[PDB]
Amino acid sequence: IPNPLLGLDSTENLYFQGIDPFTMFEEINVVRASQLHRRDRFDPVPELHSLMKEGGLTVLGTEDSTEGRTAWLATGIDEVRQVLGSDKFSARLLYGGTAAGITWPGFLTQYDPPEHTRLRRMVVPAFSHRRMQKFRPRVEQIVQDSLDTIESLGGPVDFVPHFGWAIATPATCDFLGIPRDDQADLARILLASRTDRSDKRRTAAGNKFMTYMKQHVAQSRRGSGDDLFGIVGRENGDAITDAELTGVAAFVMGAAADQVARLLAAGAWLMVEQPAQFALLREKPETVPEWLDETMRYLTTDEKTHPRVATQDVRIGNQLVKAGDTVTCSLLAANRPNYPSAEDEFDITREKAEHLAFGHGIHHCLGRAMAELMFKVSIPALAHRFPTLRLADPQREITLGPPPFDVEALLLDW
Ligand code: HEM
């Protein structure tokens, strides 16, 4: 029971007869974690900076009960690696108890070993570095086409649709063997499923996407294509279900496409804020071999991991994480430990890398090679194409939406 006589926070104050107290505990902690991972331009917000000073693991929130659950945030590099690498944390127990089945087939984030292990191993060959080498000429074409479109239009151009999404959409679709003719409509359907203010219309759009994808999976899984479905289907036969394949494909075209569009937009923004450094990349790329790792570290466009649930009492740093507690990891805090300082500032010439932008442990980014391929093609190509790239209006702040790192618009000229 919140006490609205004492405080002003709307989220904290929500109460009505018959409200679920546990649902409320989980939801306010998600909101708290989210608030902490907004950004101040490229930087952590003061609240996260303050929290980082407290120690490597702090209390996000606690349940009203005697011997109730605690939600923790890990911010120290040591604590984050320890949590994410430990077999004493479950991902699946976040979504239900032991006896609960899988909710979203193919949503790897939701699986624990041994089934996490098997399903990931089944799909891994499609995401390999070798496979990304093969995919590279297509990505190069996608990027040059996007740049041609931008240049043809004339400045100013919004790089969110014309750079982030113009690359992410065809790249993800092509990876899944989606015919060119279908792509614009699917992207439109996905927009409705991600943004429509009506939850009813949001679900109808999601349903429309998932049924297209189920059909596409059935058509493609026994075929001879180099798409994800052909690869995984030919290799695995009936060991992978249509539902599982559909989930993986949907993730790639939905959540993951959004993640890469956001990363590319954040990259283009950094380029216009740090043009002398990116001039070094354009003109002498061999002298800055760690540029990409440093960019990932600085940007950390996925600020935090999904909460993990402790399956037994476990020591994390100083603290005792009790069975049933959750720990959320701040990749942002892990990658920017020295914020603010000269050493934390973006430095394209840095050695040794860091970093944890793609997570850690068994759940670490399956799409790392694909994401890096996209970035490593896109950013240098942008630099060569528009050496004079700049903000159309240098006085206007970039508007950031809710995490993860969400550039809403990026109006650039050259
Ligand atoms: C199209 C490109 C991408 C694909 C296909 C992809 C795919 C995936 C998948 C399937 C997982 C779940 C792995 C598992 O649970 O075993 C994952 C996890 C993760 N990804 Fe990606 N990803 C992409 C881009 C990105 C980008 C741009 C970032 C941010 C830099 C990112 C950051 C992460 C992180 C931090 C995790 C771990 C989450 C956690 O531990 O809770 N990914 N990725």
Residue numbers in the entry: -22 to 391
Copied sentences from the primary study:
The biosynthesis of GPAs is based around the initial synthesis of the linear heptapeptide by a type-I non-ribosomal peptide synthetase (NRPS) and its subsequent modification by cytochrome P450 monooxygenases, which install the crosslinks that provide the unique structure and hence activity of the GPAs. In type-I GPA biosynthesis OxyB acts first to install the C-O-D ring (between residues 4/6), followed by D-O-E ring installation (between residues 2/4) catalysed by OxyA and finally formation of the AB ring (between residues 5/7), catalysed by OxyC. In this study we characterised the activity and structure of StaF, the D-O-E ring forming Oxy enzyme from A47934 biosynthesis. StaF adopts the canonical P450 fold and strongly resembles the structure of OxyAtei, with both exhibiting the long additional A’ helix at the protein’s N-terminus.
In both the StaF structures, the N-terminal (tag) region of a symmetry-related molecule forms a loop above the heme, which likely leads to the open conformation of the B–C loop region. The StaF structure is well resolved and adopts the typical structure of a cytochrome P450, which consists predominantly of α-helices (12 in total: labelled A to L, including two additional helices labelled A’ and J’). The most interesting structural feature of StaF is the long A’ helix at the N-terminus, which forms the ceiling of the active site. This helix seems to be specific for D-O-E ring catalysing P450s as it was only observed once before in OxyAtei, the D-O-E ring forming P450 from teicoplanin biosynthesis. The centre of the active site is occupied by a heme moiety, which is sandwiched between helix I and L, the loops connecting helices B and C, K and L as well as the loop connecting the last β-strand of β-1 and the J’ helix. The thiolate side chain of Cys342 serves as proximal ligand for the heme and is found in the conserved P450 heme-binding sequence (FGHGxHxCLG) in the K–L loop. The I helix contains the conserved residues responsible for controlling protonation during oxygen activation of the P450 catalytic cycle (Asp235 and Gln236). Residues projecting into the active site are Thr86 in the B–C loop, Gly231 in the I helix and Asp279 and Thr282 in the loop connecting the J’ helix and β-1. These residues make the active site more polar than those of OxyB/OxyC homologues, whilst aromatic amino acids are concentrated at the B–C-loop side of the active site, with Trp81 and Phe84 in the B–C loop and Phe228 in the I helix.
